[PDB]
Scaffold this active site. Structure first.
Site, PDB file in Angstrom:
ATOM      1  N   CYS A 178       0.866  -1.152   0.000  1.00 54.62           N
ATOM      2  CA  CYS A 178       0.000   0.000   0.000  1.00 54.62           C
ATOM      3  C   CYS A 178       0.922   1.226   0.000  1.00 54.62           C
ATOM      4  CB  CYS A 178      -1.041  -0.107   1.130  1.00 54.62           C
ATOM      5  SG  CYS A 178      -0.360  -0.518   2.760  1.00 54.62           S
TER       6      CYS A 178
HETATM    7  O1  LIG Z   1      -2.971   1.488   4.145  1.00 56.16           O
HETATM    8  C1  LIG Z   1      -1.922   2.128   3.898  1.00 56.16           C
HETATM    9  O2  LIG Z   1      -1.369   2.609   2.847  1.00 56.16           O
HETATM   10  C2  LIG Z   1      -1.167   2.462   5.030  1.00 56.16           C
HETATM   11  O3  LIG Z   1      -0.092   1.904   5.161  1.00 56.16           O
HETATM   12  N1  LIG Z   1      -1.593   3.465   5.862  1.00 56.16           N
HETATM   13  C3  LIG Z   1      -0.854   3.974   7.023  1.00 56.16           C
HETATM   14  C4  LIG Z   1      -0.156   5.332   6.766  1.00 56.16           C
HETATM   15  C5  LIG Z   1      -0.348   6.108   5.578  1.00 56.16           C
HETATM   16  C6  LIG Z   1       0.297   7.347   5.352  1.00 56.16           C
HETATM   17  C7  LIG Z   1       1.151   7.786   6.375  1.00 56.16           C
HETATM   18  F1  LIG Z   1       1.821   8.994   6.211  1.00 56.16           F
HETATM   19  C8  LIG Z   1       1.409   7.113   7.567  1.00 56.16           C
HETATM   20  C9  LIG Z   1       0.723   5.907   7.669  1.00 56.16           C
HETATM   21  F2  LIG Z   1       0.948   5.188   8.841  1.00 56.16           F
END
Ligand SMILES: O=C(O)C(=O)NCc1ccc(F)cc1F
Length: 181
Positions: free
Chosen positions: A120
Site C-alpha cells: 500500500c
Molecule cells: O494502508 C496504507 O497505505 C497504510 O499503510 N496506511 C498507514 C499510513 C499512511 C500514510 C502515512 F503517512 C502514515 C501511515 F501510517
C-alpha cells in the site's frame, strides 16, 4: 468484536500500548510473500532483484493516500499486476476483496518461482490486512496467529475497521471448521 479488536491491538502495540511504523521499506513476512510501501512498488530494479513476479497494489488510486500505478507500469518487467482501489479508513469494506486478493496470492505461489509483493502507501494497514486474510483463508491460521506472524516480520497497524473485518472472518472460518488449533 470490540474486545477481539482490542485483543488484536494488544498484539500490534508494544506492551506500553504504542504503535511503531515500519523500520524497512519491504519485508518477507511469510515464504515468498512480501509487504512493503509505495517506493518499493515503484522501483522496478529493486523488484527484479528480489525476484518479485506478482504485485498486488492494495491502495490503487489518484490521491495522496493512494499509489497511482497500473499494469502498464509493469509491462516491460514481465510482472503480473492486480490493483484494488481501497481507502485506509475504518468504514472501507476491504473484506469484499479478501477472496480476490487471496486468489491472486495463490496464483503467484502456485508457480514455484513465484514471489508476490502486497503493498500500500506505507505497507502498514491495507496491504497487511489482505495478507492476514490470505493466511486465515488459505493456510488455516486463526487471526491471532496470522496477525502475530506478520507483525513479527514487519511493523504493521491495520485500522480498527479492518481488524473488525478480520475478526468477523475468523468467526466464520472457525465455525466452518477451516482453522487449525
Ligand atoms: O494502508 C496504507 O497505505 C497504510 O499503510 N496506511 C498507514 C499510513 C499512511 C500514510 C502515512 F503517512 C502514515 C501511515 F501510517
Amino acid at each position: 468484536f470490540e474486545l477481539s479488536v482490542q485483543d488484536l491491538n494488544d498484539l500490534l502495540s508494544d506492551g506500553s500500548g504504542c504503535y511503531s511504523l515500519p523500520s524497512q521499506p519491504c519485508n518477507e513476512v511469510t515464504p515468498r510473500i512480501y509487504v512493503g510501501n509505495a517506493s518499493v512498488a515503484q522501483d522496478i530494479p529493486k523488484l527484479q532483484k528480489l525476484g518479485i513476479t506478482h504485485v498486488l497494489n492494495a491502495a490503487e488510486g489518484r490521491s495522496f493516500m493512494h499509489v497511482n500505478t497500473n499494469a502498464n507500469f509493469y509491462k516491460d518487467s514481465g510482472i503480473t499486476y492486480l490493483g484494488i482501489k481501497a481507502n485506509d479508513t475504518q468504514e472501507f469494506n476491504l473484506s469484499a476483496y479478501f477472496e480476490r486478493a487471496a486468489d491472486f496470492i495463490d496464483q503467484a505461489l502456485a508457480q514455484k518461482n513465484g514471489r508476490v509483493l502486497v503493498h500500500c502507501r506505507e505497507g502498514y494497514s491495507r496491504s497487511p490486512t489482505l495478507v492476514i486474510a490470505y493466511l486465515m483463508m488459505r493456510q488455516k491460521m486463526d487471526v491471532k496467529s496470522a496477525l502475530s506472524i506478520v507483525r513479527q516480520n514487519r511493523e504493521i497497524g491495520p485500522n480498527d475497521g479492518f481488524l473488525a473485518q478480520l475478526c468477523q472472518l475468523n468467526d466464520r472460518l472457525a465455525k466452518e471448521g477451516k482453522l487449525k488449533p
